[PDB]
Design a protein around this ligand. Structure first.
Ligand SMILES: C=CC(=O)Nc1cccc(CCOc2cc(Cl)ccc2Oc2cc(Cl)cc(C#N)c2)c1
Lengths: 399, 549
């Protein structure tokens, strides 16, 4: 129960981040939450000699109608001193993985008395009527990068019995979440998860088939001019990813100022060039590797009718992962709820595959996203993001 | 002698690596020196300050400024260097309450605390740095030396530390008396309740006794402030609020500073006054960062007529629904009113289109909605229901086909023209029986001369030569020519990624006249299918040759 020494990175002051407006019911939710946290010693009120601040807001996780408190520790985490476990490659290869919340555990551990002034947050008031309630954490705070790293020793001891019992069950931790995988493919894995639940009390995702989904070309008996023009455009784009793609024989079909709806029969040379390009796109991309020293980039496109495509990469045209998300979730009428859920699924997949989160390029104006994304967010972490304001011509190609 | 409860001092330090303030005292007149000694002696009796020995090395200058009235002199201490050297404090009272947010209270009392900073002690360890010296007469004796024992006026930490202390004392009384509502702002306190004026003035006295326990002075005498209250440039009345009168300068020649002052004064009027617009004056400000330097003027003259009739706002009732209505004013300007009951506006306002090269109405309305949404959550802690001049079918078509993600919170159509509309809509598949125009354009960078034209499937052709142009300008002209010369349905094939990116963003108005002409053509077409091909791949009809020649 001995506080461990923690300091900021050299040359970096604590976070000074503006709190943004909250609705009345989210303020009332946080007032109830933070009052009780004071009685339990988790947090304590502070004064104006603390110039530091980190934003805080409220969410409702699924399967519950109770508000939860989320702190945006992004600025603190980047300014927090780097803490001295290789990512488990088996977790991405495991048939099924289950995610658990271990955040409550962090509250048992005290936080170094010197570092607490950096965990300061503010419950805001409506209309600037009364000054905001200012708190600081006395225990390890959820969402902080130092909380999993400091608790790693205790967690290793807590799960050392379960690990010896089951050596085919993978265990990984990111932020306040625990990722438990298995090749069991058993509904009893759900009960074995209950075994890991009670074992924790004492003290559903499955990988996609393809990491990168293949580029596919249409198979047709009759091609129009427009059909051949869209094909040549896609192949030319893929020629940036794949070496030997050739468009010469297909473009020769387009010769002449022909009407768009007119059917062109393919030559035997043109049929061959398309088959050779098919074979090129069946093989995987050449020399694509993940560097843990670089950032992951995630781009998302809205495809219409609740469908969304995405690609994860570090170097353009060298995709480490591509995929598509559709949903019947309660988001059909709201594009922003769909994107926010899409951003969450992609970041979770990213945690499983490399144990880090990507920087998103979102197909949305900043002011719309910033006004609404907290309304639909359900995860204890938050990634980084930027905004794409120019339509990508490539949207059709990923569909 | 009943015991006063102690006020806990706020622990204060300096910025890291700064020793403290060592700044020499300014020369003073003998009359000013005498005047300062009388004031300081009284304060030393009050306990606000204490004399200090020669051990202290820190010093801050002091000056005397005289109000002619009563031949009176007031002490002014300049802590600017200690302010630079003092630590950073929590952000305090960033922004102010907005009157439309206040709920109505049958009785409301305002109390202004007196010598408030001097009623709150200073941390003993920091008092060493608040030292100042009073120069001696003729400089023939060592100057008198003093330090502060309480929060100095003009110090960096004094406002933050006072407000924190004031809140702590007030917290128990508020919990004990939930019926009253107390607001904190600077050196004032606003107490409001729906109680009978009798029980109200009773609890007001009880609060004053509560402050007495911690030694805080309050206006027991019938408070000089009585409704209407003038607060932060607002005129506040029991059932209505408005802006204090606005003074717009009148000059045959207007310097740049006046336009900077007149644009801000107009923005302030816009919160209650509908129809205020400062777009023309703000354009004149652009490109100018110097204070010394009109088409537009009729709208500015119209603003004076608008400001000549009195406009008031109501207070907020949480039981009724909150509503916001938006109107298109033209030239990228939007006007909105937030209200709960018809014709009774809590507040009003305007929104100006962001600086963009192209745009359309639907995007701008969307941005206006986000702004009103954030403003309302600030003011009332909730999102209003929206009344919007756009058909539901129109918004539905827009968001389902816009390549970006977009959302508007709950809203309803209000038929108040002009109505936001989609001016044109591209086809998703090629049109059967529509002539196909293959277009191209190109320019020589050195000569700035180029060509634009098309060849079609019916043998129709055109190449037009151009004088002052670029590759991007010619690529657009080619499309423009295909639109001018085609029937009501037309397929257009281009290789310009630049043009498609413009059209695929769906502008309805633009900075470039060439883009607007294309828009005017698109509006007249029944169907338009725009297809893209890669250039120089030998796609047929891609007559780079005709336009490059
Ligand atoms: C004779 C009746 C009469 O005078 N009533 C009356 C007058 C004005 C306003 C109201 C309703 C809103 O006023 C308040 C509402 C609440 Cl809940 C709490 C405090 C209020 O008063 C404030 C608030 C602020 Cl921010 C600043 C100031 C100042 N200066 C005064 C009522």
């Amino acid at each position: 129960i001995e506080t461990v020494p923690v300091k900021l990175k050299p040359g970096m002051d604590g976070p000074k981040v503006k709190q943004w407006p909250l609705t009345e019911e989210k303020i009332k939710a946080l007032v109830e939450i933070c009052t009780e946290m004071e009685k339990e010693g988790k947090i304590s009120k502070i004064g104006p000699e603390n110039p530091y601040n980190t934003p805080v807001f409220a969410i409702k996780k699924k399967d519950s109608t109770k508000w939860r408190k989320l702190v945006d520790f992004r600025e603190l985490n980047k300014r927090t001193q780097d803490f001295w476990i290789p990512h488990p490659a088996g977790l991405k290869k495991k048939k099924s993985v289950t995610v658990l919340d271990v955040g409550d555990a962090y509250f048992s551990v005290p936080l170094d008395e010197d570092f607490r002034k950096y965990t300061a947050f503010t419950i805001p008031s409506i209309n600037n009527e009364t000054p905001g309630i200012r708190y600081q954490y006395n225990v390890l705070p959820q969402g902080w990068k130092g909380s999993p790293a400091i608790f790693q020793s205790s967690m290793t001891k807590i799960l050392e019995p379960f690990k010896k019992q089951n050596p085919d069950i993978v265990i990984y931790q990111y932020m306040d979440d625990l990722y438990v995988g298995s090749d069991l493919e058993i509904g009893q894995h759900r009960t074995k998860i209950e075994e890991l639940r009670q074992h924790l009390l004492r003290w559903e995702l499955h990988p996609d088939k393809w990491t990168v989904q293949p580029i596919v070309l249409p198979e047709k008996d009759s091609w129009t001019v427009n059909d051949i023009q869209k094909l040549v455009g896609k192949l030319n784009w893929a020629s940036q990813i794949y070496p030997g793609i050739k468009v010469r024989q297909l473009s020769k079909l387009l010769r002449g100022t022909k009407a768009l709806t007119e059917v062109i029969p393919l030559t035997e040379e043109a049929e061959l060039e398309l088959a050779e390009n098919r074979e090129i796109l069946k093989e995987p991309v050449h020399g694509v590797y993940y560097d843990p020293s670089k950032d992951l980039i995630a781009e998302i496109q809205k495809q219409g009718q609740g469908q969304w495509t995405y690609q994860i990469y570090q170097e353009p045209f060298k995709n480490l992962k591509t995929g598509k998300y559709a949903r019947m979730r309660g988001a059909h009428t709201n594009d922003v709820k769909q994107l926010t859920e899409a951003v969450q699924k992609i970041t979770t997949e990213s945690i499983v595959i490399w144990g880090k989160t990507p920087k998103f390029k979102l197909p949305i104006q900043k002011e719309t996203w910033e006004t609404w994304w907290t309304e639909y967010w359900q995860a204890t972490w938050i990634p980084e993001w930027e905004f794409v304001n120019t339509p990508p011509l490539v949207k059709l190609w990923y569909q | 002698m009943v015991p006063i409860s102690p006020i806990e001092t706020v622990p204060v330090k300096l910025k890291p690596g700064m020793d403290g303030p060592k700044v020499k005292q300014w020369p003073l007149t003998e009359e000013k020196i005498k005047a300062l000694v009388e004031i300081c002696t009284e304060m030393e009796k009050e306990g606000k300050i204490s004399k200090i020995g020669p051990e202290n090395p820190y010093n801050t200058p002091v000056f005397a400024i005289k109000k002619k009235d009563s031949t009176k002199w007031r002490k002014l201490v300049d802590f600017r260097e200690l302010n630079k050297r003092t630590q950073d404090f929590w952000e305090v009272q960033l922004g102010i309450p907005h009157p439309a947010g206040l709920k109505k209270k049958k009785s409301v009392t305002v109390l202004d605390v007196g010598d408030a900073y001097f009623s709150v002690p200073l941390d003993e360890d920091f008092r060493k740095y608040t030292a100042f010296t009073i120069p001696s007469i003729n400089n023939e004796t060592p100057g008198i030396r003093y330090q502060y024992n309480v929060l100095p006026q003009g110090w960096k930490g004094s406002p933050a530390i006072f407000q924190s202390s004031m809140t702590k004392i007030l917290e128990p009384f508020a919990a004990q008396n939930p019926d009253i509502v107390i607001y904190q702002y600077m050196d004032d306190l606003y107490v409001g309740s729906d109680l009978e004026i009798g029980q109200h003035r009773t609890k007001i006295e009880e609060l004053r006794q509560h402050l007495l326990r911690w030694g805080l002075t309050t206006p027991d005498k019938k408070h000089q402030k009585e409704p209407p209250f003038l607060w932060m440039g607002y005129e506040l009345h029991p059932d209505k609020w408005t802006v204090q009168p606005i003074v717009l300068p009148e000059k045959d020649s207007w310097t740049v500073n006046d336009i900077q002052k007149l644009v801000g004064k107009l923005n302030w009027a816009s919160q209650i006054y509908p129809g205020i617009k400062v777009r023309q004056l703000s354009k004149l400000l652009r490109g100018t960062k110097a204070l010394t330097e009109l088409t537009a003027e009729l709208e500015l003259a119209e603003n004076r007529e608008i400001l000549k009739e009195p406009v008031h706002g109501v207070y907020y009732d949480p039981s009724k629904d909150l509503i916001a209505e938006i109107q298109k004013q033209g030239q990228g300007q939007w006007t909105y009113q937030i209200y709960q009951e018809p014709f009774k506006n809590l507040k009003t306002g305007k929104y100006a289109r962001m600086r963009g090269a192209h745009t359309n109405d639907v995007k701008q309305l969307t941005e206006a909605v986000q702004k009103i949404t954030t403003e309302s959550i600030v003011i009332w802690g909730k999102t209003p229901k929206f009344k919007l001049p756009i058909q539901k079918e129109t918004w539905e078509t827009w968001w389902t086909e816009y390549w970006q993600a977009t959302w508007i919170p709950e809203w309803e159509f209000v038929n108040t023209p002009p109505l936001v509309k989609l001016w044109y809509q591209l086809e998703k598949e090629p049109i059967v029986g529509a002539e196909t125009f293959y277009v191209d354009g190109a320019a020589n960078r050195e000569t700035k001369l180029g060509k634009a034209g098309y060849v079609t499937n019916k043998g129709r052709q055109k190449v037009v030569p151009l004088t002052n142009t670029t590759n991007q300008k010619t690529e657009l002209q080619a499309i423009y020519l295909a639109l001018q010369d085609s029937g009501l349905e037309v397929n257009i094939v281009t290789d310009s990624q630049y043009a498609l990116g413009i059209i695929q963003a769906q502008p309805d108005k633009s900075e470039s006249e060439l883009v607007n002409q294309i828009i005017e053509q698109l509006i007249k077409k029944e169907k338009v299918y725009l297809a893209w091909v890669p250039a120089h791949k030998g796609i047929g009809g891609n007559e780079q040759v005709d336009k490059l020649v």
